Ligand SMILES: O=C(CSc1ncc(C(=O)O)c(=O)[nH]1)c1ccccc1
């Protein structure tokens with residue numbers, strides 16, 4: 001009555017045969033799971049990766065978190081935190097003491113139902129000022145992946161068994177059914193797994209993944225992680241609810257790192273007709289989030305999770321829509337979607353054939369859109385043009401000054417404003433000079449582009 005738990009998300013228990021190929025499995029469950037936004041996956045009894053560490057030698061910099069509903073929090077940035085330092089042992093000791101002191105009970109006898117109830121009480125009661133700490137970063141020499149990775153150091157035969165698993169999250173990016181694989185541009189924050197060390201009540205605010213990608217989260221060990229998820233189709237519903245209750249979160253900001261997010265009771269969303277689902281993720285289980293599926297949660301206690309973004313062929317059209325949406329909001333991109341597409345086209349001979357077919361369809365849309373934009377800017381009197389290798393420019397040197405989109409297919413420059421670019425939607429936002437002073441900078445002619453797409457079609461057969 002104070003808190004009503006959302007209904008449970010789907011839980012899948014695949015056979016080893018069903019489980020072995022993550023991409024085939026995800027495609028199979030997608031008609032069910034995309035209706036709930038998140039789902040949980042229990043691997044077959046078979047699958048049991050080694051979880052081995054000396055907690056005395058693993059160090060990380062803790063982040064501090066206040067727990068107030070609707071209060072703005074800043075998105076985690078790589079290597080922030082500060083200079084302070086915990087080992088996994090001293091953090092665990094701190095975390096277990098916090099929880100057992102908080103409830104005056106041993107940590108495992110606190111029911112998950114109760115921690116959940118207490119979480120939503122304490123975040124709404126700002127007479128309470130509970131602060132907690134957590135770890136969040138990519139693998140480093142001081143704190144590595146919880147999955148086996150190659151290095152020597154001699155690996156056990158059981159560790160070797162899991163090196164090339166499709167569910168070893170170090171691998172998921174670089175597998176052939178993943179389209180982020182082919183991206184040459186390092187984007188560490190996105191293609192590499194994140195490591196999360198949690199404690200009771202430490203939480204992750206409501207968000208969707210960059211570029212509306214999937215995510216997959218594995219809980220290596222510890223107390224459960226509680227999740228709330230919202231299906232992709234209700235993303236704008238949720239955002240509307242949020243913009244009315246917490247308008248502060250929707251101000252334009254300097255960059256991608258200054259992104260603001262918040263804790264919000266799922267009952268509040270359910271009250272405004274946003275469908276929400278929940279789950280408790282236990283050690284050894286996976287949670288999968290689908291494209292544009294909002295999710296949030298908190299930890300039941302001391303634990304260690306690993307998560308990574310990924311993008312399947314199914315995602316490609318949504319990826320294009322996402323960048324369009326980013327343009328409308330003037331939100332920064334993590335990478336150029338078109339650059340990714342053209343990179344794959346340039347590698348058509350070595351592409352998985354299903355990938356080739358789907359890339360070809362997205363490329364066809366890209367080319368027709370580009371054709372139309374170029375005709376529009378020509379009618380605005382932009383006549384001069386020159387080829388430009390956009391992929392060579394640092395990202396922050398090829399952003400539209402208006403909408404911040406990362407340019408690749410083309411942009412407009414002007415001698416009156418050296419170094420500045422606009423995308424072709426924002427030709428009028430660059431300078432006040434006469435039209436003929438403008439230059440179309442383009443990566444490819446239409447005559448370059450159609451053969452590239454043809455190579456994909458041949459590969460797809
Ligand atoms: O703030 C975040 C990090 S997402 C995150 N997920 C899970 C945990 C966790 O299980 O402990 C966490 O600490 N953080 C974010 C990410 C993308 C866009 C905007 C914000």
Ligand SMILES: [Cl-]
Nearest residue numbers: 067122126128
């Ligand atoms: Cl509070």
Ligand SMILES: [Mn+2]
Nearest residue numbers: 208209215295
């Ligand atoms: Mn996430």
Ligand SMILES: [Mn+2]
Nearest residue numbers: 327328402403
């Ligand atoms: Mn505009």
Ligand SMILES: [Zn+2]
Nearest residue numbers: 400403423426
């Ligand atoms: Zn623009």
